[PDB]
Amino acid sequence: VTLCSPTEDDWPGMFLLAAASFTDFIGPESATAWRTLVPTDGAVVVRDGSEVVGMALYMDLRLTVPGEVVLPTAGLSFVAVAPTHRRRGLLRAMCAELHRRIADSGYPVAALHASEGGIYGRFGYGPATTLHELTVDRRFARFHADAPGGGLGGSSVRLVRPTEHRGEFEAIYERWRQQVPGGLLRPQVLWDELLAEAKAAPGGDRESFALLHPDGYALYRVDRTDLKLARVSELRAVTADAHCALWRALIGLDSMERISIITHPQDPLPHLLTDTRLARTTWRQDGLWLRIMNVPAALEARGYAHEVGEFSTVLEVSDGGRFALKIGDGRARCTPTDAAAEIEMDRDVLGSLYLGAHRASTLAAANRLRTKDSQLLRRLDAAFASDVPVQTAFEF
């Protein structure tokens, strides 16, 4: 049972493992496109002794964090162990090797999307974005008098085919991802995949349509089985006008009873309507998970809230060092120290705090971060908060 970087001959075996492990696996063509995002020495495999019984890799990503700062990020993916080789330490072996490689390569953070919620906490990953399914009964939906773009004259939104306006979607998304925490650069190969998914599948999903604004787009399709439900697969808006204008068009889908979307907790859609309750929250889950590889690099790169005044403290990460943390003027300075720790937390807790999705007081209330100073908690809460709400870019 050896561990090594895969050769070209291993990849058919990896796709076999992938097809058996992931129900969303499409095929070798799709997989080969995703594989272009994996750097040299970015993948590991476990062979028996021969066949592939384990695999894991990371992709080179660009993550937006608070203060519109873009970090290079190791995006873990394609993780799998054969059902024939469970409970044998293969994952712990593969993740440890990948983390060593990720750390030596100079990534300040690593990230993933979790198949199950109870697995990745022990490897230092904490949930850092929150997914939020809204389901609107659009038959009762009426916009508030204050809602933008609710005057007489021509509309700003166009109904279009996705494939014919790729360039406009890319431009809008690129603007969006740069200014929002949790935003990810989407490479050309993933735009290829996205647009391939938009076409009607024989005995699969229906044809997708697009609603296009200069500062926003929405992509949607009617649900396969429920013909009165429209699923918004993606909605990106750079301005509030664009966001409201797109939802006026979506609520204009008079054929449908319901419109469903996966969004974030701060989505302003409920407040656009006269009845806020019509935007029902039907589902709730962790989105992006974050492992801080380098604590001082991560903490110093991020922007902080200007509202809180200058303060100093001592943070210990359980097996990630102890640091003198000084935050002021929306910036942080994070230097080594052996002075007594004022705050203590595991590595994964810092990941959950990092983008501002989880408050430090909430994690403190669960005893996931220890501190005897409640004033320090209030300051951390405010400092680590993000003025632009945290969002989830795309799954990987």
Ligand SMILES: Cn1c2ccc(F)cc2c2nnc(SCCN3CCCCC3)nc21
């Ligand atoms: C994420 N990834 C990969 C990463 C590296 C790689 F060398 C191949 C792949 C790869 N192949 N097929 C697929 S199909 C599943 C696509 N799904 C992404 C997550 C959300 C839903 C769609 N996904 C892959």
Ligand code: NA
């Ligand atoms: Na295992």
